[PDB]
Ligand binder design. Structure first.
Ligand code: NA
Lengths: 252, 227
């Protein structure tokens, strides 16, 4: 199954200026992400950036790259611009791989693309991982997801979902035994035609409240397939300390 | 336009205790004033059975092993000899404030929404304390009124609002309490009990999540009049 990887790479970040160009053991972070993407089954990998300096760096190490619009209000918006410019067919599959995930396993990229292909009833496929800490469950910065028996998302929420009634009434310092809590991993495969729907709809109140763009799809009745990540997804990069962590993994 | 049977599942809370009548009697009073062709109490407790017959209600004693009102309710539909396409309305015994119009409403909604196996109802939440109260069931729906999920957790989460103040209700967010009333056909009840309990239902103690778990859709409508 063919699919295209798009890697969004935005220059500005509050706590890491020129974030995609920060060095990780001799290569800029964006190059590390692109290297991971090249290990996947992708038919094509394109960097989508909002800054000439990143475009130049990317072309400098061999990556296909283009300059987008700086003012996209969401990641899906940015993907739509790229898919449209590349002229991808509406039934083609595009996988969004964030430019600040240098440790992303290629198998996870393949996984979402494979899953979307296998689930015609869904317009989006994405991944989840087990939650092990109760504090993470009650952490609004951690996105929880619940699915049906076939893996279609019921919803995504920053709220402690599902609620363990008896367990939490008894103790909120421990994870309810046997209840498979899932944290959403923001790697997505999209059918290109969905991107056009997304842009035509615009923001909805549910999405705005949770601050979760994937709820726009759910609100409009589009289905999202969710699967347990085939292997572990290490945290991405937002801060100087994250860079240090990732450098150690890669020998720098 | 279509006929329906009301079944009230009561588990041994319903006895009673206010104001002068059982909660279950208040529910029954509401139900028999609806357009229901018949109202039956379903219980597995002989004390509850005796109490209901004691105020004039038709009551059936079900097997003790049922793990949900809907299971208990399926035994009754079977015993009443209802056709598989017959509509049953589950009015839970903990909803004494349900006016008969709501009962009529949920039955009508089921017939109007073939895309869903279950019709149910919701009302607005005006108190932030209710959001953070596990005893209050919240529901979120999509644009076509189909449930996304049901949860005792504060759903949906208003990120910016709750980061500022957990103790006031977020503006411009239509919070909904799920009303404990369902319409479904007898045929569906059979499938429901055959599914058996799932982990999601067991965790939230919300039987309707069994339907969501197995991929069927639930139509949610705002209650046509206040409780
Ligand atoms: Na009496």
């Amino acid at each position: 199954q063919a699919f295209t990887v798009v890697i969004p790479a935005r220059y500005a970040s509050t706590r890491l200026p020129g974030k995609p160009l920060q060095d990780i053991a001799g290569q800029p972070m964006i190059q590390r992400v692109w290297n991971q993407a090249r290990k996947s089954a992708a038919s094509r990998v394109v960097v989508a950036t909002d800054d000439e300096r990143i475009l130049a760096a990317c072309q400098g190490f061999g990556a296909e790259a283009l300059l987008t619009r700086a003012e996209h209000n969401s990641g899906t918006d940015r993907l739509e611009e790229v898919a449209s410019r590349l002229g991808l067919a509406s039934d083609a599959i595009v996988v969004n791989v964030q430019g600040d995930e240098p440790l992303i396993p290629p198998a996870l990229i393949d996984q979402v693309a494979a899953n979307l292909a296998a689930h015609p009833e869904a317009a989006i496929a994405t991944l989840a991982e087990p939650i092990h800490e109760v504090s993470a469950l009650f952490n609004p910065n951690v996105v929880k997801v619940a699915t049906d028996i076939d893996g279609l998302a019921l919803t995504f929420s920053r709220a402690p979902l599902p609620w363990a009634r008896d367990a939490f009434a008894r103790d909120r310092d421990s994870l309810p035994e046997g209840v498979p809590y899932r944290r959403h991993i923001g790697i997505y495969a999209y059918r290109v035609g969905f991107l056009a729907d997304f842009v035509a709809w615009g923001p909805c109140w549910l999405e705005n409240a949770e601050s979760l763009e994937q709820l726009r799809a759910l609100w409009h009745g589009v289905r999202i397939h969710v699967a347990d990540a085939r292997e572990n997804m290490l945290p991405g990069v937002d801060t100087p300390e994250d860079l240090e962590r990732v450098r150690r993994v890669l020998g720098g």
